Scaffold this active site. Structure first.
Site, PDB file in Angstrom:
ATOM      1  N   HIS A 178      -1.630  27.687  97.068  1.00 62.75           N
ATOM      2  CA  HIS A 178      -1.045  27.543  98.546  1.00 62.75           C
ATOM      3  C   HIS A 178      -1.998  26.666  99.263  1.00 62.75           C
ATOM      4  O   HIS A 178      -1.549  26.663 100.565  1.00 62.75           O
ATOM      5  CB  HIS A 178      -0.839  29.032  99.055  1.00 62.75           C
ATOM      6  CG  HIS A 178      -1.813  29.699  99.383  1.00 62.75           C
ATOM      7  ND1 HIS A 178      -1.998  31.126  98.657  1.00 62.75           N
ATOM      8  CD2 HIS A 178      -2.635  29.641 100.436  1.00 62.75           C
ATOM      9  CE1 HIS A 178      -3.176  31.528  99.151  1.00 62.75           C
ATOM     10  NE2 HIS A 178      -3.651  30.822 100.330  1.00 62.75           N
ATOM     11  N   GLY A 232      -8.808  32.285 105.596  1.00 62.92           N
ATOM     12  CA  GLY A 232      -9.852  31.498 105.241  1.00 62.92           C
ATOM     13  C   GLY A 232     -10.525  31.927 104.076  1.00 62.92           C
ATOM     14  O   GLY A 232     -11.212  31.273 103.317  1.00 62.92           O
ATOM     15  N   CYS A 265      -9.205  32.964 101.108  1.00 64.59           N
ATOM     16  CA  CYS A 265      -8.330  32.602  99.882  1.00 64.59           C
ATOM     17  C   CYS A 265      -9.480  31.990  99.262  1.00 64.59           C
ATOM     18  O   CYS A 265      -9.906  30.797  99.683  1.00 64.59           O
ATOM     19  CB  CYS A 265      -7.123  32.288 100.466  1.00 64.59           C
ATOM     20  SG  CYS A 265      -6.128  33.299 101.182  1.00 64.59           S
TER      21      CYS A 265
HETATM   22  C1  LIG Z   1      -5.093  33.099 102.739  1.00 64.44           C
HETATM   23  O1  LIG Z   1      -4.146  32.833 102.007  1.00 64.44           O
HETATM   24  C2  LIG Z   1      -6.022  31.967 103.055  1.00 64.44           C
HETATM   25  O2  LIG Z   1      -7.304  32.179 103.330  1.00 64.44           O
HETATM   26  N1  LIG Z   1      -5.520  30.800 103.198  1.00 64.44           N
HETATM   27  C3  LIG Z   1      -6.121  29.406 103.726  1.00 64.44           C
HETATM   28  C4  LIG Z   1      -5.128  29.198 104.815  1.00 64.44           C
HETATM   29  C5  LIG Z   1      -6.649  29.537 105.040  1.00 64.44           C
HETATM   30  C6  LIG Z   1      -4.892  34.007 103.989  1.00 64.44           C
HETATM   31  C7  LIG Z   1      -4.586  35.407 103.680  1.00 64.44           C
HETATM   32  C8  LIG Z   1      -2.807  35.434 103.659  1.00 64.44           C
HETATM   33  N2  LIG Z   1      -3.882  33.270 104.761  1.00 64.44           N
HETATM   34  C9  LIG Z   1      -4.084  32.951 106.097  1.00 64.44           C
HETATM   35  O3  LIG Z   1      -5.031  33.139 106.705  1.00 64.44           O
HETATM   36  C10 LIG Z   1      -2.929  32.087 106.787  1.00 64.44           C
HETATM   37  C11 LIG Z   1      -3.535  32.141 108.186  1.00 64.44           C
HETATM   38  S1  LIG Z   1      -4.149  30.460 108.842  1.00 64.44           S
HETATM   39  O4  LIG Z   1      -3.315  29.437 108.016  1.00 64.44           O
HETATM   40  O5  LIG Z   1      -3.900  30.454 110.392  1.00 64.44           O
HETATM   41  C12 LIG Z   1      -5.692  30.210 108.357  1.00 64.44           C
HETATM   42  C13 LIG Z   1      -6.837  30.478 109.238  1.00 64.44           C
HETATM   43  C14 LIG Z   1      -8.289  30.116 109.103  1.00 64.44           C
HETATM   44  C15 LIG Z   1      -7.543  29.211 109.890  1.00 64.44           C
HETATM   45  N3  LIG Z   1      -1.841  32.809 106.646  1.00 64.44           N
HETATM   46  C16 LIG Z   1      -0.647  32.031 106.109  1.00 64.44           C
HETATM   47  C17 LIG Z   1      -0.416  32.785 104.618  1.00 64.44           C
HETATM   48  C18 LIG Z   1       0.150  33.771 104.193  1.00 64.44           C
HETATM   49  C19 LIG Z   1       0.380  34.263 102.904  1.00 64.44           C
HETATM   50  C20 LIG Z   1      -0.165  33.549 102.093  1.00 64.44           C
HETATM   51  F1  LIG Z   1      -0.061  34.033 100.771  1.00 64.44           F
HETATM   52  C21 LIG Z   1      -0.977  32.341 102.179  1.00 64.44           C
HETATM   53  C22 LIG Z   1      -0.930  31.954 103.759  1.00 64.44           C
HETATM   54  C23 LIG Z   1       0.469  32.191 106.807  1.00 64.44           C
HETATM   55  F2  LIG Z   1       0.314  32.968 107.894  1.00 64.44           F
HETATM   56  F3  LIG Z   1       1.191  31.221 107.086  1.00 64.44           F
HETATM   57  F4  LIG Z   1       1.528  33.055 106.381  1.00 64.44           F
END
Ligand SMILES: *[C@](O)(C(=O)NC1CC1)[C@H](CC)NC(=O)[C@H](CS(=O)(=O)CC1CC1)N[C@@H](c1ccc(F)cc1)C(F)(F)F
Ligand SMILES: *[C@](O)(C(=O)NC1CC1)[C@H](CC)NC(=O)[C@H](CS(=O)(=O)CC1CC1)N[C@@H](c1ccc(F)cc1)C(F)(F)F
Lengths: 306, 306
Positions: B41, B143, B145
């Site tokens: 993702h 962040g 992930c």
């Molecule tokens: C995680 O997937 C991660 O750390 N992903 C990357 C983008 C940092 C984490 C846990 C679900 N997801 C998010 O933090 C994210 C919020 S964000 O894009 O604002 C990241 C922030 C540090 C800047 N959420 C998305 C998401 C949901 C579900 C999933 F499986 C993955 C990502 C959202 F909110 F869009 F759904």
């Protein structure tokens, strides 16, 4: 989200651990630049530990009596000196893995990570508080002496603790990296009194704020209190008195959650007087005091190191 | 002595962490040999996360769209492929810090260390269990992930977990390093049911043995029980049924302490039926289930890694 008792990443410290052997005694040392630091009781036999004369025991030792091994690398010892309860072995090679580092003496109620080591080899890492009575509740088997406690700020490792002893009560004592004991302890096999310990009030309140940030809020109530009234409860339950300095340090968490520090004190008072009523807070059935306010902000903010 | 929830020393894993950026999305990757592993993702925008077509999204991406940075070191991406829920970025340089390693799929009730990372930088390390319902109770901010879970046996790192999601309930889900989810979870922003969870009975008994070894013995009683009678209690209190395989794994601890496994089961039954009566065991006011029998033997024996 979620909240865990998390240690600093141990890699920068793993690089510094060595084995120090003197006669038949083996324990751990810390190799920084061209100096190896270890507990002075490496020079003792079980016989000596009753009441060691460390000055007389060290006079019998020459540089070549201290065997220092980093993995397979044997280090050449070119000087030795005793500073308080530590030995400083000068070696002919600077540790190439030496991190940016400082030595600090931590205050009671502050937290740090411990890297438990045996024969110079890292076993595990966990998070500890220095108790108000200057003991730690660790996990240390025979041969863990010389394991160290530390914090990390970005790239800099602050060493605060070296493990020396287990008291007959099963609690742990040690020194700063200049070899001064925390608390009244001495490096000899005697029964030694630890102070009466207390709960670290400012840390419990920090952890309550962590609970609210993570959605555990069942303990929030309609009440408030005063520093004076709260400290009467703190006394009865053997909690540290809360000061305005402690209120000031809780300011960021109060600002984030919008819960006044004295309102959170009124929640804590109700928890002390009524108990948890068979409920939990962040996976705990008691009031946790091993997270500092800085710990809570770091874990809630995602601060990293290099 | 003493007993703590201790993580593996994180150094061998710290050396493998990188940042992976695709368009505006940044998360963590794991650099082993000439391959970087990360959650698929990374290729999504918040818009995409509702129901991403990962095959179609990845077709829009070329090697040069994946920016991989190890500290300041930029890596050159020469291939990409999707395996289940992970992306495998081939890079032109083998990680010089690659440890001896394996990929393993852990069983529910097994434990592992998590290195929480943000932007490729290690934040902290803690010990987790894979819940019976294939969730973990971690500490993971936006962040995190691509942070990984692992065990270490001597010099070999067994990677078992990569962080992908937080469920609306605040619990955590992820994959093995071949990108297969643990449990029924999918990498999309939907409400997703976790199974009803249970307590890991064999781990509670392991921890009771740890308590006895450490001198906490107030819960030992005059009673015994049968596997059948005990499992009736386990059912009522949502504990995993105890099997002879579980009795066999507890054999070493039974041998050390001289307490028959069914005698320890009779202690656990009394603790489930009567509670802790305001007392603690190894610093806990509830029954802890995140130490495996192997964890207890390791921590009681002082096993080390290189
Ligand atoms: C995680 O997937 C991660 O750390 N992903 C990357 C983008 C940092 C984490 C846990 C679900 N997801 C998010 O933090 C994210 C919020 S964000 O894009 O604002 C990241 C922030 C540090 C800047 N959420 C998305 C998401 C949901 C579900 C999933 F499986 C993955 C990502 C959202 F909110 F869009 F759904
Ligand atoms: C610790 O000092 C340590 O790891 N020391 C070196 C010798 C390993 C540790 C905690 C008190 N001490 C001991 O483990 C030691 C037992 S032992 O010598 O059998 C070590 C074993 C791995 C082989 N106990 C001595 C001791 C007491 C108090 C003290 F401050 C230091 C050492 C004893 F038992 F002689 F007193």
């Amino acid at each position: 989200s979620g909240f865990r008792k998390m240690a600093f990443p141990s890699g920068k410290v793993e690089g510094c651990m060595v084995q120090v052997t003197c006669g038949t005694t083996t324990l751990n040392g810390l190799w920084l630049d061209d100096v190896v630091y270890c507990p002075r009781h490496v020079i003792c036999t079980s016989e000596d530990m009753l009441n060691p004369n460390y000055e007389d025991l060290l006079i019998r030792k020459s540089n070549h009596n201290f065997l220092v091994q980093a993995g397979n690398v044997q280090l050449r010892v070119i000087g030795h000196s005793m500073q308080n309860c530590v030995l400083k072995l000068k070696v002919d090679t600077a540790n190439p893995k030496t991190p940016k580092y400082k030595f600090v003496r931590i205050q009671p109620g502050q937290t740090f990570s411990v890297l438990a080591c045996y024969n110079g080899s890292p076993s595990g890492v966990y998070q500890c508080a220095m108790r108000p009575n200057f003991t730690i509740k660790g996990s240390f088997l025979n041969g863990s002496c010389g394991s160290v406690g530390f914090n990390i700020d970005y790239d800099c490792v602050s060493f605060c603790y070296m493990h020396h002893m287990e008291l007959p009560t099963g609690v742990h004592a040690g020194t700063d990296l200049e070899g001064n004991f925390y608390g009244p302890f001495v490096d000899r096999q005697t029964a030694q009194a630890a102070g009466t310990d207390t709960t670290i009030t400012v840390n419990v309140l920090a952890w309550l704020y962590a609970a609210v940030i993570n959605g555990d809020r069942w303990f929030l109530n309609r009440f408030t209190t005063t520093l004076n009234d709260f400290n009467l409860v703190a006394m009865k339950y053997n909690y540290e008195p809360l000061t305005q300095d402690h209120v000031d340090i809780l300011g960021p968490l109060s600002a984030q959650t919008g819960i006044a520090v004295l309102d959170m004190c009124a929640s804590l008072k109700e928890l002390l007087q009524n108990g948890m009523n068979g409920r939990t807070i962040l996976g705990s059935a008691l009031l946790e005091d091993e997270f500092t306010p800085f710990d809570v902000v770091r874990q809630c903010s995602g601060v990293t190191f290099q």
